[PDB]
Design a protein around this ligand. Sequence first.
Ligand SMILES: Cn1c(=O)n(CCCO)c(=O)c2c1nc(Oc1ccc(/N=N/c3ccccc3)c(OC(F)(F)F)c1)n2Cc1ccc(Cl)cc1
Ligand SMILES: Cn1c(=O)n(CCCO)c(=O)c2c1nc(Oc1ccc(/N=N/c3ccccc3)c(OC(F)(F)F)c1)n2Cc1ccc(Cl)cc1
Ligand SMILES: Cn1c(=O)n(CCCO)c(=O)c2c1nc(Oc1ccc(/N=N/c3ccccc3)c(OC(F)(F)F)c1)n2Cc1ccc(Cl)cc1
Lengths: 145, 644, 645, 126, 46
Amino acid sequence: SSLRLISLFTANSHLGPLQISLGRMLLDILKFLFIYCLVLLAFANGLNQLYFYYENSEGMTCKGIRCERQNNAFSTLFETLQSLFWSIFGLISLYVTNVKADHKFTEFVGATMFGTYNVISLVVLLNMLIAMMNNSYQHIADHAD
Amino acid sequence: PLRIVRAESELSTQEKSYLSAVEKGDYASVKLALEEAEIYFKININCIDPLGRTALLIAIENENLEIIELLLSFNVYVGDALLHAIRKEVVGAVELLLNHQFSDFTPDITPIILAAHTNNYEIIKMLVQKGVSVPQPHVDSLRHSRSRLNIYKALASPSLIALSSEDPFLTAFQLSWELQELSKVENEFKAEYEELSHQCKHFAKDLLDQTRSSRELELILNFRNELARLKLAIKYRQKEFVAQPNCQQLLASRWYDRHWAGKLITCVFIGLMFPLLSLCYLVAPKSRYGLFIRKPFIKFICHTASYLTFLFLLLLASQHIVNPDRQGPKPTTVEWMILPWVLGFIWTEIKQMWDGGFQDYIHDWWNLMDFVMNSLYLATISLKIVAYVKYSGCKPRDTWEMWHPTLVAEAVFAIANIFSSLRLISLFTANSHLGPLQISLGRMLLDILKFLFIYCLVLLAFANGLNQLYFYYENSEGMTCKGIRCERQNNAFSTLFETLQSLFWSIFGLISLYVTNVKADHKFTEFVGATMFGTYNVISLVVLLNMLIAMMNNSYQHIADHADIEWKFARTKLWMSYFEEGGTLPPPFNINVRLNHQYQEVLRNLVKRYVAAMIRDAKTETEENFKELKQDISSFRYEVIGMM
Amino acid sequence: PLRIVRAESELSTQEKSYLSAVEKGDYASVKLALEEAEIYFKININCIDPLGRTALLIAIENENLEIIELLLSFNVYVGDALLHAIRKEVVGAVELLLNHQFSDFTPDITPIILAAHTNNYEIIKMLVQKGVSVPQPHDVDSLRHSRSRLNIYKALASPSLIALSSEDPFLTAFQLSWELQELSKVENEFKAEYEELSHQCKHFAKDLLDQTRSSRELELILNFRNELARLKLAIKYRQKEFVAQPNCQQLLASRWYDRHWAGKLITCVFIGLMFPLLSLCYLVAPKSRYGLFIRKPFIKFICHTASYLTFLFLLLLASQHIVNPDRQGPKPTTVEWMILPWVLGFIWTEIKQMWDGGFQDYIHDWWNLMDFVMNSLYLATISLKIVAYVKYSGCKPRDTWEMWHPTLVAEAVFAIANIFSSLRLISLFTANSHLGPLQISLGRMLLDILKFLFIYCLVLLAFANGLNQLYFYYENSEGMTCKGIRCERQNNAFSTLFETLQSLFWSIFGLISLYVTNVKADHKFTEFVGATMFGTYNVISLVVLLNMLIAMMNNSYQHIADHADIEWKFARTKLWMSYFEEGGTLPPPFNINVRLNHQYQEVLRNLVKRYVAAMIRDAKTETEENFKELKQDISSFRYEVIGMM
Amino acid sequence: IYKALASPSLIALSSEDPFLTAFQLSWELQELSKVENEFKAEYEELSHQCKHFAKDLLDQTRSSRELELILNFRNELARLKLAIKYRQKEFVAQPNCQQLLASRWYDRHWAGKLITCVFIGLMFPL
Amino acid sequence: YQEVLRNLVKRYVAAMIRDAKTETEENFKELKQDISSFRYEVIGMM
Ligand SMILES: Cn1c(=O)n(CCCO)c(=O)c2c1nc(Oc1ccc(/N=N/c3ccccc3)c(OC(F)(F)F)c1)n2Cc1ccc(Cl)cc1
Ligand SMILES: Cn1c(=O)n(CCCO)c(=O)c2c1nc(Oc1ccc(/N=N/c3ccccc3)c(OC(F)(F)F)c1)n2Cc1ccc(Cl)cc1
Ligand SMILES: Cn1c(=O)n(CCCO)c(=O)c2c1nc(Oc1ccc(/N=N/c3ccccc3)c(OC(F)(F)F)c1)n2Cc1ccc(Cl)cc1
């Protein structure tokens, strides 16, 4: 209800043209969301497959990533898909890659998967979203009045 | 389909030869055609063309004064042929026609208006000599709109201004002012009006470009105290006129009246002993330094060192050398030194207030910032005075009640120190490298302020839906803290104020993920709240903050285009604020008969040079080598006639 | 400065007027001046004006033939006037001069080479009719050896010369453009001119193909020398412009396809649902009803895609808790038995593709090395599983297993393996008109990212060296059950090189806390130094280094996106042509010329004739078309006046 | 055929109502640029030239009396609504018809407009 | 409406021909015209 008040911006000489050009650099973002979703699915399918054999629920008041002491980040597909999403904003801690065992080899592989996902999605994928958005505003503002 | 002809007819079978004779340059045939048609031979010497051109019209397209004279020798209808000749740039046809329902011109067009539209010195002069007038610009909306744009277009032509204006400089200053005002009230015709305003601004610069001496330039800028016409050129916002190389070179000679580490040391040394120069100017301004402080560059340096000393005193107020925690304390030794600076700033602002009469005083950012800072300082002084006579005594600061006057005074003083240190930005326009950067950094700041209208709406929309869901779960049992600003963040969405606070700190990632939890087993409302938080996070940084920089890039391109005239305008405005007398003491202290003839001669010479340059700028610029080719064949034809 | 004219001379007092008369076009004056036959009053007919122009060369500059013939009748010295006439493109001067130390032309320049340079059809044909030969392109004064080689390649790569002296202009343009591209890599000083010469050769083939009038001609050009033989030959030579032509793209799409937004996706899904029906029908009976239906390339593409999405489904279903506890050395489950046919089919396809090319141009592409890594990882997984099954048995708690256990490594490698399997599916974006150009221009700007890694890694190593050298003497391991930065209380960030190298990587994303720079001692000076170096690394990598990685990507996106439709069309046709043949119509789960020359040359002759006609008779206008109109009028006037009297 | 049927000279010479053929042909030349995707960059430009022709034709009005007759041909503003349906953004965003529309819409300074708008909006129930 | 449309089309045609014929390209015509006039005068005298 409160997000429909923006449609009234097309009545001011200043906020009018800006809103029209904003809604035209939005079909470009939709096209770029078919790659991030595939990358997210590909990395979740690996992280969950690696970490699904270490699911524990002993002596914990809560269970999930939305907790004071995060745990079971990659235990299930539902939690893996939404723990990777929250890592774009830096709200997932590093210790969630550990397990209750001395298996140092698997923890390193999981941390490497997490870091590889972080690199691709944040410095390789979100930087070329700006590159094509800036190079499409030029072709949009030519016919904007 | 079967294509046909609609609403048209055929011309003739005999008039085709007559119309082709004037087209192919023949003269004997056209002589015979009109001579034989004397006794009503039904040839209709006023024919028509597929393009709509009569016999007289074609003779003007291909300029042939002999055919035109032969035609006007007989009784032929002229109609709007004078307008056609004026628009077709034929001086001979215009001269011939001057002394002798379907139209392609609007009813409001007069020959003088169209000639001024064409911008030709000879035709405009010829029309003016015979005596013409233009209506004064002040039911039908379409006709009244395209009748004042035509008048203003004809009134802003450089040729007409140079021809029939008593003072072409003033009528170019005022014309650009009226045309720029009219663009605001005339939203449909806004591009047309703003282009004419720019044209009148370049005319003044081009007319000033024809000064061949330093005595002619010192006579134009000093007309009607010192630099009187230069100050008037700024009131009308003539950026091109001010930012002229000769004007800047003349102004730099009054500003100043070497390597970087031969001048930085000199500036530091000069600014080291500003109190000595101030004392010398205050006790005896005869020889030693009573005029040294009067130099604009020395005065600028001394005024900067005084402000830098003031900022250093505000840094020493927080040192623990300069008090216990007692209610209503006496001012420290540092604040006693701070007081004169504040009093001087207040006095300067007061003495500057009445000059503008509260009109255009609050027009720039810096004057409003000064007002806010001065008001905050006055509030600090008032609160410190109040707290001394009523809320006295000594008490531990942990036991004080919030809203205590001694606390509000310190808070208001702390806020005022931020504004006084940010005022140092305005000194960046005096540098060649930091100058243009600051101008481009303040003109795209207004660009940002338009994207902050949508962020407020999005923030309000999401805070409406988060609080509405999370308000019923508020609890404060066993909690010494209540809010997000503590180690265990809680009640993040329990009230509208804290919902607005916690939705702003999430832009920088300072809000943890467990604040979306409740002390219950309701795992469906928790997921919904987390989804709202995530959706707000998505379209605030990935989407909304990405198009903020996408348009910043493409608005910096236009700003940086003309970025050297704006910086020079700002620097000249900063410079001339130190030329005059009054305010030469730092804030720590201080607590026309034989005049018009020369100008008229200079103006006559300048206009003559301008017209001499403008005739060559058009008659020569692959068009100059077109009249020689016609002259060669004309001479050949004349020679052949002479021999034959 | 009292300046003077250095290193010059003066011409004469008499021949200046003769040169002026020659310039003005006065026939009588220059005729009587030259009448000093064998008795001259010290006037040289070979005088040189101060700008180097000669009387014979002056008439060439105005292409006025009367004084040209008059001078030629008196045996004036020519020397190189033919080259000047060729360069200025005057047909009459070349006609007259063809039958009769300082030079402004490079010594190895021959008239044919310069004529081919000017790209004038008439002069080249005129010279060829007499019989000439350009040296073949196939070291002591290397400056003029490279210049001479460049000149003959510029003459060879001219549309006019190719159109009248080539057996097959469609073939001499493919090879010559290929060798021009690879010759720009061995001569790096002239790489900007060799590569711009090859680009004009690719446009020539496209322009020659643009002159087809009917579909009968087009299908005969591309089928020369089983099907679409010449079209595949152009793909081998990387002729993107030739391939991405609308007229041939239409035919290729007609072969590919052999409705609205909601009317196409639904039927695509409907076709893809019964993937294993008309795949077993193919094996049972290849009849027109069902066996030949999958033969359509569009249907075959959908079958291979739905069969791959099915593989990605039960790949996602192998991590479910429903489908062999935590037992040591287990047998494969029921999902892995279904997984095995897909892996076997992929391995068989890679094996049959391996020897088909001999690892030349087969592993050079990025979409084959990833596949090889994927099958290698799958093979390692199955080998580790079968090794662990025969030497390990007994149910044991998982927490008690020692690391490097074969089962653990097997599942880790399997988890790594299927990440690449899902990421390979991004290669199908090139078949869609919306995600096609976006994906093609996505992996092309990615190559510019690889160059910032070479400086990022150097900065990382430089700072890691200093951080380790400072902090390696303070490490401790008592009272710490958990050790490292992947812990609730990070304690040993900069203790070893391996830990320092990865604690600086995690600081890009802000996952390293500020208390990891503290030591268990009252040494404030070293702690401050370590914090300062950590902050300096943060500033350089996040405020400077990564800020200017995006500052060029948009400035390089402009060049990439300029011709972004030709590359996408080339990729799409490369994808299409892999489904046009027989051999791949079996998804991996179910796989475990006497007259021809006559017609071709008779079509090509007409094509070349149309091209040359449109190139000469339709390019004089491209203002210059009306310049000769005034000359025609003046010539008619002159002829009428002269003949009347 | 389409490139010849879109020429302004032929429309201005052999059309009963050129304001309608520039609307109808510009619409069917825009949706035709999708079925023939191979030749689409030239069909789109062909449709674009049929949109500027209408704007140029409507730019020849001399008085406001004839302008109100063009926009009201065939209730009120019957042809302005028809142009919006055909997505003729150039025919609609013309200064003369903008100025006419603004007079119907409205039927002051920065601080003299907001203070009046808020007063009007604060007394809307009555 | 038909009368107004006729006026509009006539004005548009006039503007189109004026803009197309005039737009350097017009400078060619005044050369051909004077050449033809001189030629016709020469033939008339002879
Ligand atoms: C993806 N990732 C990752 O997930 N974690 C988490 C591990 C779990 O704790 C890292 O710690 C890490 C990392 N990436 C790097 O740094 C580079 C830098 C450049 C590279 N390549 N540059 C180029 C340049 C040009 C051409 C080709 C490659 C590169 O790739 C590489 F070297 F192959 F691994 C890795 N680190 C830090 C690190 C590095 C080395 C070591 Cl021995 C230990 C930690
Ligand atoms: C907004 N958000 C969110 O608040 N949380 C927090 C929930 C509680 O913490 C998420 O966890 C989350 C999320 N977004 C995604 O991932 C996508 C990405 C793109 C999508 N669609 N893209 C397009 C692009 C173009 C056209 C159409 C769609 C999409 O589909 C969806 F849901 F419809 F947005 C979901 N996740 C992670 C996640 C995903 C799936 C599942 Cl089952 C669980 C978690
Ligand atoms: C790199 N770094 C850092 O690692 N830590 C961590 C130390 C332990 O936690 C800081 O705290 C820090 C810092 N940088 C600054 O602030 C600047 C910023 C720009 C400067 N100059 N910019 C330019 C730009 C162009 C040309 C010349 C100079 C500059 O001047 C200086 F010192 F020279 F860098 C200082 N601070 C905060 C700080 C400031 C002052 C003080 Cl006394 C203490 C802390």
